Design an enzyme around this catalytic site. Structure first.
Site, PDB file in Angstrom:
ATOM      1  N   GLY A 108       0.788  -1.244  -0.120  1.00  0.00           N
ATOM      2  CA  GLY A 108      -0.052  -0.001   0.056  1.00  0.00           C
ATOM      3  C   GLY A 108       0.925   1.049  -0.015  1.00  0.00           C
ATOM      4  N   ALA A 109       1.788   1.048  -0.552  1.00  0.00           N
ATOM      5  CA  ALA A 109       3.069   2.221  -0.825  1.00  0.00           C
ATOM      6  C   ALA A 109       3.444   2.942   0.282  1.00  0.00           C
ATOM      7  CB  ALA A 109       2.202   3.317  -1.938  1.00  0.00           C
ATOM      8  N   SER A 195       4.442  -5.907  -2.541  1.00  0.00           N
ATOM      9  CA  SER A 195       4.705  -4.536  -3.137  1.00  0.00           C
ATOM     10  C   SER A 195       5.567  -3.726  -1.755  1.00  0.00           C
ATOM     11  CB  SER A 195       3.481  -3.873  -3.239  1.00  0.00           C
ATOM     12  OG  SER A 195       3.697  -2.602  -3.935  1.00  0.00           O
ATOM     13  N   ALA A 196       4.828  -2.712  -1.011  1.00  0.00           N
ATOM     14  CA  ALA A 196       5.564  -1.757  -0.081  1.00  0.00           C
ATOM     15  C   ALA A 196       5.809  -3.033   1.012  1.00  0.00           C
ATOM     16  CB  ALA A 196       4.632  -0.962   0.457  1.00  0.00           C
ATOM     17  N   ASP A 321       3.353  -5.901 -13.044  1.00  0.00           N
ATOM     18  CA  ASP A 321       3.417  -5.019 -12.025  1.00  0.00           C
ATOM     19  C   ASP A 321       3.308  -3.659 -12.155  1.00  0.00           C
ATOM     20  OD1 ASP A 321       5.353  -7.286  -9.754  1.00  0.00           O
ATOM     21  OD2 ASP A 321       3.338  -6.630  -9.528  1.00  0.00           O
ATOM     22  N   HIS A 425      -7.598  -9.380 -11.214  1.00  0.00           N
ATOM     23  CA  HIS A 425      -7.531 -10.905 -11.397  1.00  0.00           C
ATOM     24  C   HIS A 425      -6.042 -11.119 -11.580  1.00  0.00           C
ATOM     25  CE1 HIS A 425      -9.481 -14.736 -11.266  1.00  0.00           C
ATOM     26  NE2 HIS A 425      -8.661 -15.015 -12.303  1.00  0.00           N
TER      27      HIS A 425
HETATM   28 ZN    ZN Z   1      -8.032 -16.805 -13.168  1.00  0.00          ZN
HETATM   29 ZN    ZN Z   2       0.443  -6.883  -5.823  1.00  0.00          ZN
END
Ligand code: ZN
Ligand code: ZN
Ligand code: NA
Ligand code: ZN
Ligand code: ZN
Ligand code: ZN
Ligand code: ZN
Ligand code: ZN
Ligand code: ZN
Ligand code: ZN
Ligand code: ZN
Length: 523
Positions: A108-109, A195-196, A321, A425
């Site tokens: 979440g950065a 991510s973060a 990403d 997705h």
């Molecule tokens: Zn799928």
């Molecule tokens: Zn991700």
């Protein structure tokens, strides 16, 4: 005899919930809202939480740390937010003991997030039940401070920053002291995060604060070397917040003291990140993130990898990403009836390469648009923008981290992956956490195939440091990464022997690590 009951922790007794699973005696013990640190004070390091009398009912998720809503017009959470949650799987004969422990760190950065994650189809994203019971591991989730309240800094001792990283460290330290009481092996803690949270996982392995605490780690779509992770000019961001809330900006010590006694909601809402009509790439407005403080992060992360010499390590990325950030920086990739042009892409590339000037913009533009002559379609052009963002924000940093970790390894093993599918997705968190099994109406059989394989690899790795060895079968032998083989596992809906691949986008890696760096810096 087959479940925990009241659990004796350093702070006193804790009582969770036992949830029967299946028909034959299995179950899972669930604890939510165990405090691992005191109520926070604005811009101060976390402190021990005092013990309690009687039995603490750990029955419900507790408040997240104060943060902006996605509209950015208000806040929610609370200063009393340093809580964690625990799933312990139980078999039908006797209570679990010496289990591997996996600690999740959300992304979440560095600006938003909580230990339970978004709720969908009546299920929280980070609900640890599916991982815990399918891989026979304990799963811990927890909250840490985000935004200005997590990361405001002057870049000196007046306001050193990194409060949110210290919160993560305090949860890890608590797990090490306490998890054996729950049936966990404290010598076998694996961190994982996306991510973060992947960059957080990375920074935790590099910090000397965690000496002797971490056995293994998984970075998903983010490492400490990603360009959005370390704020190089924190005093600029702290002055911006001070001006907005009425604090003077001339003396760093008086400014710091005034910020500490400003309404925490005003600090949190002081700066709104704009997502439309931007002068610079989305990256530039990433402000309140970790800093090199000479303490928790003693040096530039690239120089810290001796600290992870005995931490087994998985790091990988998702195929697209970079998509979210590409969409903001170049909105044309969204509309099927709007064109990405060479001129739009040059401009974006030039913003990313300004320290290498005109020459750096051109060499980069030329290498990424080489394929446009033979394939000038918008499908190829828009995929180039996504690949460019994925490369610089995620893939290239992850490959440099893999190489540094391998180069500093003593006993540590190293593994690389690329996740490719087909929240969106395409994101891998929901498969790691087993949502296609927890809410099967939202998912196809192929999704449960992907999720079953990722949980097998992740929890084998937690148990043994070897994703192929543990309580679960795997579809493809995952070869440990070396500089020689540069192998990565390609995780898809159909895996077999050829899923084990090598030299992921190697020409672009070489471009960024050799060619681009060999250019003169411009001023
Ligand atoms: Zn799928
Ligand atoms: Zn991700
Ligand atoms: Na559940
Ligand atoms: Zn409390
Ligand atoms: Zn909540
Ligand atoms: Zn409060
Ligand atoms: Zn034991
Ligand atoms: Zn410590
Ligand atoms: Zn910038
Ligand atoms: Zn510019
Ligand atoms: Zn092998």
């Amino acid at each position: 005899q087959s479940k925990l009951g009241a659990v004796y922790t350093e702070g006193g007794f804790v009582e969770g919930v036992n949830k029967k699973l299946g028909l034959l005696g299995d179950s899972v013990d669930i604890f939510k809202g165990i405090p691992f640190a005191a109520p926070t004070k604005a811009l101060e390091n976390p402190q021990p939480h005092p013990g309690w009398q009687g039995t603490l009912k750990a029955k419900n998720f507790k408040k997240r740390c104060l943060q902006a809503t996605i509209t950015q017009d208000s806040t929610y959470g609370d200063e009393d937010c340093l809580y964690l949650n625990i799933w312990v799987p139980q078999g039908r004969k006797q209570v679990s003991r010496d289990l591997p422990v996996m600690i999740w760190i959300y992304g979440g950065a560095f600006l938003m997030g909580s230990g339970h994650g978004a709720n969908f189809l009546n299920n929280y994203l980070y609900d640890g039940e599916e991982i815990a019971t399918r891989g026979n591991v304990i799963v811990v989730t927890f909250n840490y401070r985000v935004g200005p309240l997590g990361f405001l800094s002057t870049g000196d001792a007046n306001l050193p920053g990194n409060y949110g990283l210290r919160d993560q460290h305090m949860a890890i330290a608590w797990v090490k002291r306490n998890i054996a009481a729950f049936g966990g092996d404290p010598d076998n803690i694996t961190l994982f995060g996306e991510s973060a949270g992947g960059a957080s996982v990375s920074l935790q392995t590099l910090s000397p604060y965690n000496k002797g605490l971490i056995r293994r780690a998984i970075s998903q779509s983010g490492v400490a070397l990603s360009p959005w992770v370390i704020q190089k000019n924190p005093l600029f961001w702290a002055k911006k917040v001070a001006e907005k809330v009425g604090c003077p900006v001339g003396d760093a010590a008086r400014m710091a003291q005034c910020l500490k006694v400003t309404d925490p909601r005003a600090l949190t809402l002081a700066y709104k990140v704009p997502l439309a009509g931007l002068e610079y790439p989305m990256l530039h407005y990433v402000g309140f993130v970790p800093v090199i403080d000479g303490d928790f992060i003693p040096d530039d992360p690239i120089n810290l990898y001796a600290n992870a010499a005995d931490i087994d390590y998985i790091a990988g990325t998702n195929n697209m990403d970079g998509h979210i950030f590409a969409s903001i920086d170049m909105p044309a990739i969204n509309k099927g009836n709007k064109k990405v042009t060479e001129e739009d892409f040059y401009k974006l590339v030039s913003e990313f390469t300004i320290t290498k000037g005109l020459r750096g913009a051109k060499t980069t533009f030329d290498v990424y648009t080489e394929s446009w002559a033979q394939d000038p379609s918008q499908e190829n052009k828009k995929k180039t923008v996504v690949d460019f963002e994925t490369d610089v924000l995620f893939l290239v940093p992850t490959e440099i981290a893999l190489a540094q970790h391998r180069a500093n390894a003593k006993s540590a093993k190293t593994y690389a992956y690329l996740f490719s599918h087909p929240a969106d997705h395409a994101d891998d968190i929901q498969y790691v956490f087993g949502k296609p099994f927890a809410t099967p109406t939202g998912y196809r059989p192929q999704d449960r195939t992907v999720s079953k394989a990722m949980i097998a690899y992740w929890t084998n790795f937690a148990k043994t440091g070897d994703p192929n060895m543990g309580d679960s079968a795997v579809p493809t032998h995952w070869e440990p990464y070396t500089t020689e083989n540069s192998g990565y596992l390609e995780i898809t809906k159909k895996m077999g022997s050829s899923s084990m691949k090598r030299s992921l986008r190697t020409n672009f890696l070489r471009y960024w690590t050799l060619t681009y760096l060999a250019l003169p810096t411009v001023t």
